[PDB]
């Protein structure tokens, strides 16, 4: 066939029901999830070639960075929680892997500041049952799946993307190659 289990794409052992439709896992201190963000935009290429209907969900990990992985986990649960991830996606991977000032919570804190959240409407954030929530949603997604590597994808709780399986000599290629495959496991 064209598109291969185990070439482009490996499937679930063990699916999972009730699974958002197009999932992407990822870290700040990713540096493949940075690539994937700054300079391939992999999330916005499978957007544009997803079908009417699709809603795509991202969600940041605990397993890297220690104390502050899991303040970024918490950051991005209030970056979902306000619709800011447009705003802080690239100062905080920039923060992390370029910079490197980011190195407490107060200096993730800094980079909403500095998007125009307001310390107050962080902070409430921050603190709020509702981010403790989608903190937990995080964690679970990610638990669901047997999850120890980003930057992942799996669509409808099925399938995994596998990157490894493309060719990397052309970065538009293998951009289109990707998210080609998001499309066709979604008609599956």
Not at 28 to 45: A, G, R, T
Not at 84 to 100: A, R
Not at 138 to 156: H, I, S, T, W, Y
Not at 160 to 172: A, E, K, R
Request: hydrophobic residues 40%; contains cysteine.
């Amino acid at each position: 066939a064209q598109y291969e289990d185990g070439k482009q794409y490996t499937t679930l052992e063990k699916p999972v029901a009730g699974a958002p439709q197009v999932l992407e896992f990822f870290s700040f201190f990713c540096p493949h999830c940075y690539q994937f963000e700054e300079v391939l935009h992999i999330s916005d290429n499978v957007k544009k070639k997803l079908p009417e209907g699709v809603k795509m969900t991202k969600y940041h990990v605990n397993f890297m960075g220690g104390d502050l992985g899991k303040d970024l986990t918490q950051a991005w649960a209030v970056a979902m929680a306000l619709g800011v991830e447009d705003k802080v996606t690239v100062p905080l991977f920039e923060g992390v892997q370029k910079t490197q000032t980011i190195r407490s919570a107060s200096d993730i804190r800094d980079v909403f500041i500095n998007a125009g959240i307001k310390g107050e409407e962080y902070d409430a954030a921050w603190n709020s049952f509702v981010v403790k929530s989608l903190v937990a949603q995080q964690e679970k997604a990610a638990a669901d799946v047997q999850l120890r590597g980003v930057p992942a994808m799996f669509v409808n709780g099925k399938y995994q993307l596998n990157p490894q399986g493309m060719d990397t000599s052309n970065m538009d290629v293998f951009v289109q190659q990707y998210a080609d495959t998001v499309k066709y496991l979604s008609e599956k």
